Amino acid sequence: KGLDAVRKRPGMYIGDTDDGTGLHHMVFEVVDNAIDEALAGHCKEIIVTIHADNSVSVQDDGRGIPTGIHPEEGVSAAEVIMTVLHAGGKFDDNSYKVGLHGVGVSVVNALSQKLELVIQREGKIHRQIYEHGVPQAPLAVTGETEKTGTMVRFWPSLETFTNVTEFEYEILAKRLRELSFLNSGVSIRLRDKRDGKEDHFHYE
Ligand SMILES: Cc1[nH]c(C(=O)Nc2nc3c(OCc4cccc(C(=O)O)c4)cc(C(=O)O)cc3s2)c(Cl)c1Cl
Ligand SMILES: [Mg+2]
Structure with missing residues (x-):
C-alpha cells in the first residue's frame, strides 16, 4: 500500500518530477540516510557516484542495514525498510x-x-534487487568481507521522471559541500562516470 501511494503521488514525496527537482531529491534522500549513519557515529566516508547510465549509487562505511529476519514481516529487515513506507x-x-x-x-x-x-x-x-520497489529475490549472501556498510544504486523510473532524466553534477556537488561542512567528521566523495569528474569534500 505504501509504495503504491508514492508511485501514484510522487510529487507529495520527492517534488516536481518534470523539472529535475524530484530527480535530484532522490539522491538527497539516499545521502541523508548515509549522513544519519555518520551522525550516529558509525559512517566516516560516503561515496556518491553518477554512473554512465544516469543511475546514482551511494556507498557508506557504517554498520550496514540489518539483514536478519524481521520478527513481524518474516523477511529480511533490509527488505522491510526498502518496501514498507511506514517502517x-x-x-x-x-x-x-x-x-x-x-x-x-x-x-x-x-x-x-x-x-x-x-x-x-x-x-x-x-545483495537484493528491486524493480519499481518490488523485490526480485530475497536478500542473498554473495560473499565474505571484513568491512561494513551499505550501497544503494538506483535507476530513476522513466515512467515517473520526464524531461530532466540526467543528473546535474553541480546540483549534487553543492548539497554534498553543505553536508561536508555541517558533518565535519565525514569524508564525502562525488564521482561522475559520465565524464570522469571527481571531488572530495572534508571539513579542514
Ligand atoms: C545509504 C544508506 N545507509 C543506510 C544505513 O546505513 N542505515 C542504517 N540503519 C540502521 C539501523 O536502523 C534502521 C532504522 C530503522 C527505522 C528507523 C531508523 C531511524 O534512523 O529513525 C533507522 C540499525 C542498525 C543496527 O541496529 O545495526 C544499523 C543501521 S545502518 C541507509 Cl537506510 C541508506 Cl539508504
Ligand atoms: Mg495511512
Missing part, C-alpha cells in the same frame, strides 16, 4: 498531509525502475 518512520501513505527524522529510502525504491542494495555486515556481503 522507516519518515513517510506515510496520507494523500492529504505531507518530516525531519527516519529512513526515507523506500520512496527512492518506489520511484526507481531498478534498485540494487548491497550490505556488508557480520563478515558477509548481501
